[PDB]
Amino acid sequence: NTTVFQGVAGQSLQVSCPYDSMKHWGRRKAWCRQLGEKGPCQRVVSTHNLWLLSFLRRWNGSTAITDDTLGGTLTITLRNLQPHDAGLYQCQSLHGSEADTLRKVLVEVLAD
Ligand SMILES: *[C@@H]1O[C@H](CO)[C@@H](O)[C@H](O)[C@H]1NC(C)=O
């Protein structure tokens, strides 16, 4: 059961990944995109490298990430949604070599 997010193309879309603020305390977060089914997942952007500053927005081009570590809500903004921006993404909580999956989403688009 993934979840879906619909966006009008040319205007911005926000996705929210809720999580347990305590379970993932001190953990960096990342937003990545999927290719085909089984893999790979490729990192688009991660929250600030210093956890106390993860409330700072981070950008990879048109994609922004911000983390509310106290309330436990990660928020990704796809500014100016595009057709090619559509696809299957996930939010990740990182620890050591591994990453755990916080939420799994599709993005949809409509022109005009
Ligand atoms: C930023 O650009 C795209 C995100 O869509 C990705 O392929 C690339 O690896 C990103 N850069 C880094 C350093 O993660």
Numbering used by the authors: 20 to 131
What text does the study give?
TREM2 is an innate immune receptor expressed on dendritic cells (DCs), resident macrophages such as osteoclasts and microglia, infiltrating and inflammatory macrophages, and CSF monocytes (Colonna and Wang, 2016). It is a type one receptor protein consisting of an extracellular V-type Ig domain, a short stalk, a transmembrane domain that associates with the adaptor protein DAP12 for signaling, and a cytoplasmic tail. For example, whole genome and whole exome sequencing has identified point mutations in the gene encoding the protein TREM2 (triggering receptor expressed on myeloid cells 2) that correlate with a significantly increased risk of developing Alzheimer’s disease (AD). We found that NHD-causing mutations impact TREM2 protein folding and stability, whereas AD risk variants decrease binding to the cellular TREM2-ligand (TREM2-L).
We previously reported the crystallization of the WT human TREM2 ectodomain (amino acids 19–134) purified from a mammalian cell expression system. We determined the crystal structure of the TREM2 ectodomain at 3.1 Å resolution and found that the disease-linked mutations exhibit distinct structural patterns, suggesting that they would impact TREM2 function through alternate mechanisms. The TREM2 ectodomain is a V-type Ig domain containing two disulfide bonds, the canonical Ig disulfide between residues C36 and C110 (βB–βF) and an additional linkage between C51 and C60 (βC-βC’). A single N-acetylglucosamine (NAG) glycan that remains after Endo Hf treatment is clearly visible in the electron density at residue N79. The nine β-strands characteristic of proteins within this Ig domain class are present, and two short α-helix passages are observed spanning β-sheets B–C and E–F. The asymmetric unit (ASU) contains two monomers of hTREM2 in a parallel arrangement, but the limited buried surface area (~400 Å2) and chemical nature of the interface suggest that this dimer would not exist in solution. The side chains of mutations causing NHD (Y38, T66 and V126) are all buried within the core of the Ig fold, whereas the side chains of verified AD risk variants (R47H and R62H) and possible AD risk variants (N68K, D87N and T96K) all lie on the protein surface. R47, the residue with the strongest link to AD as the R47H variant, is at the end of the loop preceding β-sheet C. It is well-ordered in the structure with the side chain lying parallel along the surface of the protein, and the side-chain amines engage the carbonyl oxygen of T66. Indeed, anionic bacterial carbohydrates, phospholipids, myelin lipids, and even purified DNA all activate TREM2 reporter cell lines. This is not surprising in light of our crystal structure, which reveals an extended basic patch on the surface of TREM2 that would be capable of forming electrostatic interactions with these anionic ligands.
